[PDB]
């Protein structure tokens, strides 16, 4: 109904991963710890 989604234009290829995703992994460590609980 609301029409299709258009993905954003990528002005440049990322040579690395943002530090946000690094922090997501850092907190996924404690996520796996909770999985161990």
């Amino acid at each position: 109904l609301a029409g299709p989604l258009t993905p954003p234009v990528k002005h440049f290829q990322l040579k690395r991963k943002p530090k946000s995703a690094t922090l997501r992994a850092e907190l996924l460590q404690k996520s796996t710890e909770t999985a161990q609980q």
Binding site: L5, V9, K10, H11, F12, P18, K19, S20, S31, A35
Partner: protein, 174 residues
């Protein structure tokens, strides 16, 4: 259930199910309003801030929530507490600058750099803008489209260091 329980550490306990469940858009909005009202309390940064991490899942995984997240952090980038000194205020501001640089990396580049230009011309000290440029030129890969240069480089005229700034200015003027 989690949000109205008035959660911090327990968030990190069930952050797995959270980032599993933020993929639902409406749930992402709900957590955004919850963390907004928790973090918008005066002096919520003196006691746990894990909540600012969750925007990373939201904005990265939902494109149309880029306008909200920045338009949340515009308030948080103006945080000022007499208890948490200007050093800690600048720490939180630089943290939020890293968040805004990440959100720029997702394509929300015109309004980010426009507001950065406005608050430098205003509030935001030259140290914060220099740290912005430091993190940006440390993370952004060339080529740099002129739609981004047109606001990033003429505000970068104030400084010349973070050398990556010299490389950026030379590449983007040549």
């Amino acid at each position: 259930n989690l949000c109205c329980n008035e959660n911090a550490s327990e968030l990190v306990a069930e952050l797995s199910t959270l980032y599993q469940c933020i993929r639902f858009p409406v749930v992402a909005m709900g957590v955004l309003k919850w963390v907004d009202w928790t973090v918008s309390e005066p002096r919520y940064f003196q006691l746990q801030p894990v909540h600012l991490a969750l925007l990373d899942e939201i904005s990265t995984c939902h494109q149309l929530l880029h306008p909200q997240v920045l338009q949340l952090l515009v308030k948080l980038f103006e945080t000022e507490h007499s208890q948490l000194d200007v050093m800690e205020q600048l720490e939180l501001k630089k943290t939020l600058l890293d968040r805004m640089v990440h959100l720029l990396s997702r394509g929300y580049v015109l309004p980010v750099v426009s507001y950065i230009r406005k608050c430098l011309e205003k509030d935001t000290d030259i140290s914060l803008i220099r740290y912005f440029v430091t993190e940006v030129l440390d993370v952004i890969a060339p080529p740099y489209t002129s739609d981004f240069v047109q606001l990033f480089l003429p505000i970068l005229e104030n400084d010349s260091i973070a050398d990556p700034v010299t490389e950026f200015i030379a590449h983007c003027k040549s």
